[PDB]
C-alpha cells in the first residue's frame, strides 16, 4: 500500500489569479505534487482543490 503523503503548511494567503492557480490561506495543509521549470510555482492540493501556488508561500510541516 502507498504511504500517507508528508504535508506542507501555507505561510501566507494567496488569492488565485486564474490560470490554474489555487487560492490558499495561512495555516491550511497542502500536499505537494511538484514544481514548474524554475521552481517558483508549486502544484499543490488542499481541501479546496488543486492548482499552482507560489513555492515560497508554503513550507514543510511535521
Amino acid at each position: 500500500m502507498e504511504n500517507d503523503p508528508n504535508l506542507f503548511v501555507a505561510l501566507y494567503d494567496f488569492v488565485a489569479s486564474g490560470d490554474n492557480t489555487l487560492s490558499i490561506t495561512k495555516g491550511e495543509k497542502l500536499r505537494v505534487l511538484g514544481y514548474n521549470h524554475n521552481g517558483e510555482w508549486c502544484e499543490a492540493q488542499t481541501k479546496n482543490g488543486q492548482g499552482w501556488v507560489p513555492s515560497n508561500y508554503i513550507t514543510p510541516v511535521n
Binding site: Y12, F14, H37, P54
Partner: peptide, 10 residues
C-alpha cells in the same frame, strides 16, 4: 504553471 512569476512573499 503560469508563465508569469508569482507574487513575492508579503
Amino acid at each position: 504553471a503560469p508563465t508569469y512569476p508569482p507574487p513575492l512573499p508579503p
